[PDB]
Amino acid sequence: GELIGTLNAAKVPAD
Amino acid sequence: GVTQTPKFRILKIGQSMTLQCTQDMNHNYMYWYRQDPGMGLKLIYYSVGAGITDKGEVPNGYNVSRSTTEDFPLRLELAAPSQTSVYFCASTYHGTGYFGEGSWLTVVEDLNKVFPPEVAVFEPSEAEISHTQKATLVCLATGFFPDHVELSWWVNGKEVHSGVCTDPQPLKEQPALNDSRYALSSRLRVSATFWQNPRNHFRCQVQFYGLSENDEWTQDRAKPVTQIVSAEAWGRAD
Amino acid sequence: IQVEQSPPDLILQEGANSTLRCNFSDSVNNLQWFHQNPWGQLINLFYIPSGTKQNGRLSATTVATERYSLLYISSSQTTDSGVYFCAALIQGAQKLVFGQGTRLTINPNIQNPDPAVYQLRDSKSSDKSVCLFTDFDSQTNVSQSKDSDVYITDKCVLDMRSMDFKSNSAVAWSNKSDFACANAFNNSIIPEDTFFPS
Amino acid sequence: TRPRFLWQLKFECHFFNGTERVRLLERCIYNQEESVRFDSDVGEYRAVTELGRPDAEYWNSQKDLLEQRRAAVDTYCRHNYGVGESFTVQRRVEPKVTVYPSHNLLVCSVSGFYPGSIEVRWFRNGQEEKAGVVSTGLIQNGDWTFQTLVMLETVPRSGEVYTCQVEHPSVTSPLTVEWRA
Amino acid sequence: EHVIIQAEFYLNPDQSGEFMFDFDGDEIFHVDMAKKETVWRLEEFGRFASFEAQGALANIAVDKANLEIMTKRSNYTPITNVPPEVTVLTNSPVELREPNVLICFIDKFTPPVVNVTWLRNGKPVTTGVSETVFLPREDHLFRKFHYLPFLPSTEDVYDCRVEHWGLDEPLLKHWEFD
């Protein structure tokens, strides 16, 4: 049945 | 933004090829699309990150790999006519989607099907000058296969945009014929006074993308390489 | 799954307001609007997953609750022609996904129409000629040819910026010896009082 | 065995009176310490500790990220509630209620029910008995059922009718199971 | 009233990462990393809902990139091991000779890594066993349930044996028909 959604991981800044 | 290479390519049947696609934005998700003339964007392949690839609606005949976040190369194993299309690459992650400038690809029966445009320029008419105080130059590009042209207007050595129109659709010289050649028309209208100055020069300029230094060529006529072809008029005092 | 876009086709006069509808199923979200242009180029107009967002003459609303988005274009310009795509993101798979789009055509507003058919010659050896049909209003429809040896272009719109003056033209040509500019276009539906010089 | 490093991401969707008010809380936790978070009732990331200050700063300059996070309340939170609602939010499993001695200690065993929220009351001859009610508590079993054991301290005598009543969303009327001395 | 958590971790050296949804503290589903499939906590859930797991798989890969970077920013600060409380309960009031389940509640611990074995009179009993993934807590520690169906009998001693980097030694938690 209906698709459960996601929220995407945020990238921490490159050092 | 996203950058993709071949903007233009002519491929023979059976040949292979790679379209590069790169993006410096750190988007993890990338996609290849195709588009058929005046139709929808269909999905070939996509990737949400390094080492993760997944089929789209139309994946059959294409492969794809994503060893880095940045790059998303599309690879055509074996060219079939059905693969004549405009390809588009994209990236998003959290929001806005970003598109490459496009890849126009024509797959050909054999390279002898490739033709340059001839280009003529037609001076404005004495009658229009009289009846409007305006003068319109017409430029025809005729008899070019691949539909891979960029037509531009140059007035006294500088490209001009105001007063120009170029057909957004080319037309078939043999509508019936499967891979017929193409014609295409453009206009530059200027004021009559401007046209009447004999020190004004008008060039109509067409960039054709054809064969490469790497394709064999046997035929009597000129090998149809990438090239600029043109025609020019000077304004007249009488 | 999918993304249903409404009017597949829209032709409006410049300066008019146009509303575009994109209905999206439960399986997708996080809506977007794109403009292709008649050379295949695509830019984002909005990332607009919810609420109202505005950028010049453009504005967009999405009601995530109710599964629709709406692109508004006020004071339409000829330059806005092209195809407007709406697109969403499949929930879970982050498959970006595109509707069939809305071909938008914004015609110029020919205040003083002055329809005319002019003949023009090649500057390089004057055997070649071209027929320019010019200055008809935007309702004048240029048909294709009876003859396969006779060539006729879709009209297109030129802007003479310094004179704020737009004009319409279609070019016709052929090299069959029984072709003149009198009837080059009479296979189309041209205004009764079209200027035919000579 | 040797040192560990742990990163945790959590997106919490908190629901009040149905989907009427909704609040999204995105959290990052390094080595059990929360360091940065987007709270949807705030509208931007804040550093919870100094560790996360570079991250709060950085994310707050990414527009697509803020706007997505701000709409998530509808695009994600309200969305997922709609998908799972029928079988999560509306999941009804009726308790099984047995009552047995333990003299001096009486047990109302209440097991296998679902949602957690419940009332068990004790009755001595159909009059409520509130003194000496002891409650092991409410146990989540991990499998989408809870269980409870509510005690009552009474030394039973002949005749006496004892009764346990259990209110539950799974039953319109409350279960009364009796036990006789 | 209700809370739904998409809960994720990656564990730096173990190279475990998990992904799962939590509703008021019950797993709806997790993603099996090895098989890249959605694994519904109750079988029926999969009929009333679906999950397309790509996004989940890519978050874990970001979670790891992040860990990689947080590990360093902290000047390589290890995690402070925290030992679990363990509790052994049945599913329902133990009835002689009528099928029941034993629950091993493992609670309030960090690194989400544990070794859990059921013991029956001494011998490990592997048949019929099952377990939950690592579920979230508000304090950021973890929970986790192990199950064993059995025939309650007068003869049997059952231990839940729990191993962890916070405990000096394996913890045996006792159970026998009351």
XYZ file of N, CA and C in Angstrom, chain C:
594
model
N 3.695 7.894 -7.124
C 3.765 7.406 -8.529
C 3.862 8.568 -9.525
N 2.794 9.380 -9.595
C 2.560 10.277 -10.745
C 2.068 11.715 -10.473
N 2.011 12.480 -11.566
C 2.069 13.939 -11.600
C 1.223 14.419 -12.805
N -0.019 14.838 -12.556
C -0.979 15.174 -13.619
C -1.030 16.674 -13.861
N -0.628 17.101 -15.048
C -0.515 18.525 -15.311
C -1.626 19.033 -16.183
N -2.234 20.161 -15.815
C -3.446 20.649 -16.523
C -3.296 22.014 -17.234
N -4.155 22.319 -18.231
C -4.057 22.368 -19.696
C -2.754 21.776 -20.226
N -2.833 20.618 -20.903
C -1.667 20.272 -21.705
C -1.194 21.470 -22.550
N -2.120 22.286 -23.046
C -1.791 23.381 -23.972
C -2.491 24.674 -23.619
N -1.755 25.767 -23.745
C -2.263 27.091 -23.448
C -1.649 28.078 -24.423
N -2.503 28.816 -25.120
C -2.080 29.953 -25.925
C -2.782 31.220 -25.435
N -2.013 32.208 -24.996
C -2.592 33.453 -24.454
C -1.909 34.698 -25.010
N -2.592 35.839 -24.979
C -1.961 37.079 -25.424
C -0.991 37.610 -24.362
N 0.049 38.341 -24.778
C 0.988 38.948 -23.812
C 0.233 39.782 -22.792
N 0.781 39.896 -21.599
C 0.177 40.731 -20.555
C -0.975 40.073 -19.804
N -1.454 38.942 -20.331
C -2.457 38.138 -19.657
C -1.854 37.330 -18.495
N -2.739 36.922 -17.584
C -2.393 36.077 -16.462
C -2.763 34.647 -16.791
N -1.870 33.729 -16.454
C -2.006 32.336 -16.806
C -1.872 31.552 -15.506
N -2.735 30.549 -15.316
C -2.647 29.631 -14.178
C -2.396 28.189 -14.619
N -1.356 27.575 -14.058
C -0.984 26.193 -14.398
C -1.230 25.294 -13.208
N -1.802 24.118 -13.470
C -2.190 23.174 -12.414
C -1.430 21.883 -12.548
N -0.945 21.417 -11.418
C -0.244 20.173 -11.348
C -0.784 19.443 -10.135
N -1.549 18.376 -10.381
C -2.032 17.479 -9.323
C -1.141 16.227 -9.073
N -0.746 16.000 -7.818
C 0.172 14.912 -7.457
C -0.430 13.894 -6.484
N -0.257 12.615 -6.811
C -0.673 11.507 -5.965
C 0.100 11.423 -4.653
N -0.494 10.716 -3.686
C 0.068 10.491 -2.340
C 1.498 10.009 -2.357
N 1.866 9.237 -3.383
C 3.206 8.657 -3.499
C 4.348 9.645 -3.753
N 4.060 10.929 -3.869
C 5.119 11.875 -4.164
C 4.986 13.167 -3.360
N 6.062 13.925 -3.238
C 5.930 15.247 -2.652
C 7.087 16.163 -3.003
N 7.130 17.280 -2.301
C 8.275 18.158 -2.358
C 8.427 18.810 -3.717
N 7.290 19.299 -4.184
C 7.066 19.850 -5.497
C 8.004 20.910 -6.001
N 8.076 20.988 -7.322
C 9.002 21.849 -7.990
C 8.372 22.344 -9.281
N 8.823 23.489 -9.768
C 8.421 23.910 -11.092
C 9.619 24.220 -11.994
N 9.536 23.718 -13.230
C 10.552 23.939 -14.234
C 9.958 24.587 -15.448
N 10.781 25.397 -16.096
C 10.516 25.930 -17.435
C 11.511 25.328 -18.412
N 11.190 24.426 -19.298
C 12.103 24.201 -20.422
C 11.978 25.423 -21.355
N 12.877 25.659 -22.278
C 12.589 26.693 -23.241
C 12.658 26.057 -24.613
N 12.267 26.792 -25.667
C 12.152 26.076 -26.944
C 13.505 25.606 -27.513
N 14.572 25.674 -26.726
C 15.848 25.070 -27.123
C 16.297 23.961 -26.172
N 15.366 23.454 -25.370
C 15.642 22.309 -24.501
C 16.292 22.612 -23.162
N 16.576 23.877 -22.895
C 17.189 24.305 -21.643
C 16.163 24.298 -20.488
N 16.577 23.882 -19.290
C 15.692 23.746 -18.117
C 16.279 24.475 -16.903
N 15.468 25.302 -16.247
C 15.850 25.945 -15.007
C 14.751 25.655 -13.985
N 15.130 25.674 -12.710
C 14.144 25.588 -11.686
C 13.455 26.943 -11.548
N 12.152 26.915 -11.286
C 11.427 28.135 -11.050
C 11.217 28.261 -9.541
N 10.775 27.168 -8.934
C 10.587 27.097 -7.499
C 10.860 25.677 -7.001
N 11.452 25.611 -5.816
C 11.266 24.487 -4.947
C 10.181 25.022 -4.039
N 9.030 24.354 -4.040
C 7.849 24.892 -3.358
C 6.974 23.786 -2.681
N 7.533 23.086 -1.679
C 6.839 21.915 -1.146
C 5.556 22.281 -0.399
N 5.453 23.526 0.049
C 4.304 23.983 0.830
C 4.303 25.505 0.951
N 3.141 26.116 0.749
C 2.953 27.555 0.944
C 2.999 28.359 -0.339
N 3.122 29.670 -0.190
C 3.236 30.514 -1.355
C 4.658 31.091 -1.513
N 5.196 31.008 -2.728
C 6.521 31.571 -3.044
C 6.449 32.382 -4.328
N 7.207 33.468 -4.357
C 7.090 34.464 -5.405
C 8.451 34.968 -5.923
N 8.560 35.092 -7.239
C 9.782 35.544 -7.892
C 9.450 36.326 -9.153
N 9.451 37.648 -9.014
C 9.014 38.551 -10.073
C 7.553 38.331 -10.448
N 7.295 38.209 -11.753
C 5.957 37.935 -12.261
C 5.477 36.508 -11.944
N 6.371 35.628 -11.481
C 5.955 34.273 -11.097
C 5.634 34.144 -9.604
N 4.622 33.323 -9.312
C 4.329 32.858 -7.942
C 3.766 31.450 -8.016
N 3.962 30.692 -6.935
C 3.540 29.289 -6.839
C 2.885 29.009 -5.490
N 1.818 28.222 -5.481
C 1.290 27.727 -4.225
C 1.218 26.226 -4.288
N 1.565 25.569 -3.185
C 1.340 24.151 -3.023
C 0.562 23.927 -1.742
N -0.510 23.148 -1.820
C -1.120 22.656 -0.611
C -0.834 21.165 -0.488
N 0.242 20.861 0.238
C 0.608 19.471 0.511
C -0.580 18.638 1.022
N -1.316 19.154 2.008
C -2.558 18.506 2.466
C -3.364 17.978 1.269
N -3.663 18.864 0.311
C -4.679 18.634 -0.748
C -4.144 18.217 -2.130
N -2.829 18.061 -2.214
C -2.175 17.301 -3.281
C -2.065 18.031 -4.642
N -2.100 19.364 -4.592
C -2.008 20.192 -5.793
C -0.998 21.314 -5.654
N -0.411 21.682 -6.790
C 0.423 22.868 -6.914
C -0.100 23.756 -8.056
N 0.261 25.031 -8.009
C -0.229 26.027 -8.961
C 0.833 27.095 -9.266
N 1.256 27.169 -10.528
C 2.182 28.198 -10.979
C 1.353 29.330 -11.525
N 1.617 30.549 -11.057
C 0.926 31.734 -11.577
C 1.913 32.600 -12.336
N 1.507 33.074 -13.501
C 2.322 33.989 -14.280
C 1.469 35.191 -14.561
N 1.819 36.315 -13.956
C 1.151 37.552 -14.253
C 1.828 38.236 -15.430
N 1.055 39.004 -16.197
C 1.599 39.868 -17.225
C 2.559 39.086 -18.133
N 2.030 38.008 -18.725
C 2.811 37.042 -19.502
C 3.644 37.698 -20.582
N 4.893 37.294 -20.728
C 5.709 37.833 -21.817
C 5.949 36.741 -22.841
N 6.098 37.135 -24.115
C 6.372 36.220 -25.230
C 7.527 35.280 -24.899
N 8.472 35.815 -24.132
C 9.672 35.093 -23.731
C 9.391 33.919 -22.791
N 8.248 33.947 -22.089
C 7.827 32.863 -21.197
C 7.352 31.628 -21.961
N 7.234 31.692 -23.278
C 6.834 30.511 -24.050
C 7.741 29.354 -23.698
N 7.337 28.148 -24.064
C 8.068 26.947 -23.712
C 7.195 25.973 -22.934
N 7.831 25.079 -22.205
C 7.105 24.044 -21.575
C 7.347 24.176 -20.097
N 6.253 24.129 -19.349
C 6.317 24.211 -17.917
C 6.094 22.840 -17.351
N 7.143 22.332 -16.710
C 7.076 21.049 -16.034
C 6.950 21.198 -14.531
N 6.057 20.403 -13.938
C 6.010 20.232 -12.485
C 6.605 18.863 -12.157
N 7.217 18.750 -10.987
C 7.895 17.514 -10.642
C 7.922 17.300 -9.150
N 7.866 16.059 -8.734
C 7.857 15.771 -7.340
C 8.873 14.690 -7.014
N 8.966 14.370 -5.732
C 9.898 13.365 -5.272
C 9.084 12.227 -4.665
N 9.130 11.057 -5.312
C 8.558 9.800 -4.779
C 8.979 9.634 -3.318
N 8.036 9.325 -2.428
C 8.371 9.113 -1.027
C 9.157 7.819 -0.865
N 10.335 7.936 -0.279
C 11.129 6.775 0.049
C 12.254 6.682 -0.949
N 11.978 6.102 -2.119
C 12.880 6.195 -3.242
C 12.907 7.678 -3.480
N 14.069 8.275 -3.708
C 14.050 9.714 -3.974
C 14.169 9.901 -5.472
N 13.261 9.202 -6.135
C 13.110 9.256 -7.549
C 12.330 10.542 -7.819
N 13.028 11.481 -8.461
C 12.463 12.704 -8.992
C 11.706 12.282 -10.230
N 10.602 12.943 -10.520
C 9.615 12.367 -11.397
C 8.786 13.469 -12.047
N 8.652 13.426 -13.379
C 8.090 14.580 -14.140
C 6.760 14.319 -14.836
N 5.821 15.254 -14.684
C 4.573 15.244 -15.445
C 4.773 15.540 -16.929
N 3.744 15.309 -17.738
C 3.811 15.613 -19.166
C 3.999 17.094 -19.529
N 3.735 18.043 -18.627
C 4.007 19.474 -18.883
C 2.926 20.318 -19.555
N 3.071 21.639 -19.517
C 2.113 22.511 -20.205
C 2.817 23.361 -21.252
N 2.626 23.043 -22.543
C 3.128 23.905 -23.623
C 2.458 25.268 -23.452
N 3.232 26.276 -23.083
C 2.695 27.630 -23.035
C 3.215 28.429 -24.231
N 2.306 29.094 -24.938
C 2.679 29.980 -26.025
C 2.075 31.320 -25.751
N 2.926 32.351 -25.694
C 2.466 33.718 -25.460
C 2.635 34.568 -26.715
N 1.512 34.819 -27.382
C 1.497 35.582 -28.613
C 1.618 37.076 -28.405
N 2.268 37.765 -29.358
C 2.429 39.199 -29.298
C 1.149 39.906 -29.657
N 1.051 41.141 -29.209
C -0.147 41.929 -29.379
C 0.029 42.955 -30.480
N -0.265 42.543 -31.712
C -0.105 43.388 -32.897
C -1.158 44.503 -32.919
N -0.825 45.643 -32.325
C -1.748 46.796 -32.263
C -2.237 47.247 -33.652
N -1.299 47.599 -34.535
C -1.631 47.989 -35.911
C -1.206 46.908 -36.879
N -2.064 45.896 -37.071
C -1.702 44.850 -37.999
C -1.561 45.462 -39.360
N -0.658 44.914 -40.153
C -0.424 45.399 -41.494
C 0.037 44.192 -42.307
N -0.821 43.163 -42.451
C -0.388 41.919 -43.093
C 0.145 42.185 -44.504
N 1.259 41.535 -44.842
C 1.903 41.690 -46.149
C 2.793 40.494 -46.545
N 2.866 40.223 -47.844
C 3.760 39.192 -48.367
C 4.819 39.811 -49.274
N 6.072 39.838 -48.823
C 7.157 40.450 -49.598
C 8.058 39.412 -50.236
N 8.673 39.763 -51.364
C 9.660 38.875 -51.986
C 11.086 39.365 -51.804
N 11.967 38.439 -51.458
C 13.345 38.774 -51.126
C 14.296 37.898 -51.904
N 15.407 38.470 -52.355
C 16.343 37.715 -53.190
C 17.658 37.444 -52.475
N 18.338 36.380 -52.901
C 19.716 36.105 -52.480
C 20.626 37.242 -52.972
N 21.500 37.745 -52.101
C 22.553 38.675 -52.538
C 23.619 37.984 -53.385
N 23.805 36.687 -53.152
C 24.672 35.835 -53.974
C 23.927 35.276 -55.197
N 24.016 35.954 -56.334
C 23.394 35.457 -57.578
C 21.866 35.293 -57.416
N 21.132 36.190 -58.070
C 19.727 36.497 -57.747
C 18.663 35.551 -58.351
N 19.014 34.279 -58.541
C 18.031 33.277 -58.951
C 17.188 32.804 -57.753
N 17.815 32.652 -56.585
C 17.110 32.248 -55.363
C 16.251 33.378 -54.802
N 14.998 33.057 -54.462
C 14.146 33.953 -53.658
C 13.318 33.270 -52.539
N 12.944 34.086 -51.569
C 12.280 33.680 -50.345
C 11.035 34.564 -50.260
N 9.911 34.012 -49.789
C 8.702 34.816 -49.537
C 8.508 35.033 -48.045
N 8.479 36.301 -47.655
C 8.279 36.670 -46.268
C 6.837 37.121 -46.136
N 6.097 36.438 -45.279
C 4.761 36.847 -44.889
C 4.958 37.442 -43.526
N 4.574 38.699 -43.378
C 4.936 39.454 -42.177
C 3.792 40.347 -41.707
N 3.755 40.560 -40.393
C 2.977 41.621 -39.746
C 1.487 41.323 -39.536
N 1.097 40.063 -39.675
C -0.292 39.648 -39.413
C -0.485 39.550 -37.899
N -1.721 39.642 -37.435
C -1.970 39.578 -36.006
C -1.780 38.148 -35.558
N -1.899 37.902 -34.265
C -1.508 36.619 -33.715
C -2.554 35.516 -33.912
N -3.714 35.862 -34.472
C -4.775 34.879 -34.745
C -4.677 34.327 -36.158
N -3.867 34.985 -36.980
C -3.656 34.574 -38.348
C -2.881 33.269 -38.339
N -3.479 32.219 -38.905
C -2.818 30.912 -38.922
C -2.156 30.420 -40.207
N -0.832 30.299 -40.143
C 0.007 29.887 -41.263
C 0.042 28.368 -41.412
N -0.679 27.855 -42.406
C -0.705 26.421 -42.666
C 0.565 25.919 -43.356
N 0.697 24.593 -43.383
C 1.744 23.895 -44.119
C 1.293 23.744 -45.572
N 2.183 23.268 -46.446
C 1.917 23.289 -47.899
C 1.289 22.035 -48.506
N 0.398 22.258 -49.482
C -0.130 21.213 -50.373
C 0.984 20.396 -51.029
N 2.025 21.102 -51.479
C 3.136 20.547 -52.246
C 4.287 20.196 -51.314
N 4.884 19.028 -51.532
C 6.017 18.578 -50.722
C 7.305 19.272 -51.138
N 7.290 19.843 -52.339
C 8.409 20.628 -52.837
C 8.338 22.107 -52.430
N 7.265 22.495 -51.738
C 7.122 23.868 -51.240
C 7.294 23.938 -49.710
N 8.221 24.782 -49.261
C 8.582 24.874 -47.842
C 7.963 26.086 -47.139
N 7.300 25.851 -46.002
C 6.727 26.936 -45.178
C 7.040 26.753 -43.695
N 7.585 27.800 -43.074
C 7.954 27.781 -41.660
C 6.809 28.187 -40.721
N 6.783 27.625 -39.511
C 5.921 28.161 -38.473
C 6.264 29.618 -38.302
N 5.268 30.408 -37.955
C 5.503 31.797 -37.655
C 6.425 31.802 -36.468
N 7.228 32.857 -36.356
C 7.890 33.161 -35.103
C 7.923 34.681 -34.821
N 8.283 35.043 -33.588
C 8.044 36.376 -33.039
C 9.345 37.202 -32.864
N 9.503 38.263 -33.640
C 10.703 39.082 -33.483
C 10.404 40.388 -32.728
N 11.338 40.770 -31.864
C 11.190 41.929 -31.002
C 12.200 42.992 -31.382
N 11.705 44.138 -31.858
C 12.558 45.302 -32.122
C 12.555 46.215 -30.896
N 13.414 45.898 -29.926
C 13.362 46.461 -28.565
C 13.348 47.972 -28.460
N 14.170 48.620 -29.265
C 14.292 50.061 -29.189
C 12.986 50.778 -29.584
N 12.197 50.134 -30.447
C 10.895 50.656 -30.881
C 9.706 50.017 -30.136
N 9.983 49.304 -29.046
C 9.005 48.397 -28.418
C 7.979 47.970 -29.448
N 8.444 47.169 -30.409
C 7.658 46.732 -31.546
C 7.935 45.257 -31.811
N 6.941 44.407 -31.561
C 6.995 42.989 -31.943
C 6.247 42.736 -33.267
N 6.699 41.746 -34.033
C 6.137 41.437 -35.330
C 6.230 39.935 -35.580
N 5.281 39.410 -36.358
C 5.191 37.984 -36.699
C 5.622 37.759 -38.134
N 6.328 36.674 -38.399
C 6.695 36.345 -39.785
C 6.715 34.822 -40.035
N 6.318 34.405 -41.234
C 6.588 33.041 -41.681
C 7.308 33.152 -43.001
N 8.343 32.343 -43.188
C 9.044 32.310 -44.459
C 8.552 31.130 -45.288
N 8.316 31.353 -46.576
C 8.053 30.247 -47.484
C 9.046 30.243 -48.640
N 9.415 29.062 -49.116
C 10.269 28.956 -50.288
C 10.148 27.585 -50.982
N 10.679 27.534 -52.204
C 10.728 26.345 -53.066
C 11.587 26.696 -54.283
N 11.907 25.701 -55.106
C 12.600 25.973 -56.364
C 11.906 25.372 -57.576
N 10.721 24.804 -57.357
C 9.790 24.503 -58.443
C 9.486 25.798 -59.194
N 9.607 25.768 -60.522
C 9.443 26.974 -61.350
C 8.013 27.546 -61.349
N 7.027 26.730 -60.966
C 5.650 27.217 -60.823
C 5.289 27.602 -59.362
N 6.197 28.347 -58.731
C 5.992 28.886 -57.390
C 6.273 30.391 -57.366
N 5.271 31.168 -56.970
C 5.444 32.599 -56.728
C 4.861 32.959 -55.366
N 5.164 34.164 -54.894
C 4.722 34.602 -53.573
C 3.240 34.954 -53.493
N 2.583 35.062 -54.641
C 1.152 35.321 -54.681
C 0.388 34.197 -53.990
N 0.762 32.962 -54.295
C 0.072 31.793 -53.771
C 0.924 30.957 -52.805
N 2.131 31.437 -52.520
C 3.006 30.782 -51.557
C 2.227 30.419 -50.303
N 1.400 31.361 -49.860
C 0.642 31.219 -48.627
C -0.862 31.049 -48.791
N -1.392 31.245 -49.996
C -2.853 31.217 -50.189
C -3.466 29.830 -49.900
N -2.585 28.845 -49.717
C -2.908 27.522 -49.174
C -3.189 27.587 -47.658
N -2.791 28.698 -47.045
C -3.083 29.006 -45.648
C -4.319 29.911 -45.628
N -4.704 30.386 -44.444
C -5.844 31.309 -44.308
C -5.350 32.719 -43.957
N -5.125 33.529 -44.989
C -4.518 34.856 -44.838
C -5.574 35.964 -44.987
N -5.388 37.100 -44.274
C -6.313 38.245 -44.277
C -6.624 38.770 -45.675
N -7.901 39.069 -45.915
C -8.388 39.561 -47.205
C -7.547 40.686 -47.831
N -7.033 41.588 -46.997
C -6.329 42.780 -47.473
C -4.798 42.734 -47.317
N -4.227 41.529 -47.381
C -2.774 41.327 -47.364
C -2.063 42.018 -48.541
N -1.049 42.826 -48.237
C -0.267 43.524 -49.270
C 0.535 42.554 -50.172
N 0.154 42.523 -51.445
C 0.837 41.744 -52.461
C 1.385 42.719 -53.508
N 2.646 43.177 -53.325
C 3.292 44.096 -54.286
C 3.765 43.402 -55.575
N 3.759 44.143 -56.696
C 4.050 43.646 -58.070
C 2.847 42.940 -58.695
